[PDB]
Design goal:
By secondary structure, the chain is α/β, with parallel strands linked by helices. It has four helices and six strands. It has helices at residues 12-16, 20-24, 61-70, 118-124; strands at residues 30-35, 43-49, 53-60, 77-88, 93-105, 116-117. A hairpin with a 7-residue loop joins strand 1 and strand 2. The longest helix is centred in the middle third of the chain and has 10 residues, at 61-70. The protein is globular, with a radius of gyration of 14 Å.
Length: 130
């Protein structure tokens, strides 16, 4: 059919934190907003999904202004444009720092949901990350 669902970058979160090349350029990923629940007005911490894992993303600078103005919510699909990963070694926490993104689709289908938290996957395989 022409109207197939928009494809998320499945496996990209795992690749960002295991592969040096992807870590160094973690842009172009297509993800779905998983959770937007509140606590900063110049920084929005949200949960995003790649279809397999969900992970924390901290929207800063123009991504923060855009998120707030667009009122992005669970189910919305975005494309990350400016980003850098963050590994909090002392707490075994993983965050994608997002400075810019684009809206791909608002209110997209979110069915047969099986994504698990990225940090928990790495807890099960401790020496896997970079």
């Amino acid at each position: 059919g022409p109207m197939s669902s928009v494809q998320l970058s499945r496996g990209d979160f795992h690749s960002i934190f295991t592969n040096k090349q992807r870590y160094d350029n973690p842009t172009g990923g297509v993800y779905q907003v998983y959770n937007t629940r509140k606590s900063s007005n110049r920084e929005n911490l949200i949960m995003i999904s790649d279809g397999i894992y969900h992970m924390k993303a901290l929207l800063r600078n123009q991504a923060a202004s855009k998120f707030q103005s667009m009122e992005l919510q669970r189910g919305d699909i975005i494309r990350v444009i400016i980003a850098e990963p963050a590994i909090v070694r002392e707490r075994k926490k993983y965050v994608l720092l997002v400075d810019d993104f684009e809206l791909v689709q608002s209110r997209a289908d979110m069915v047969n949901q099986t994504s698990t938290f990225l940090d928990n996957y790495f807890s099960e395989h401790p020496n896997e990350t970079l």
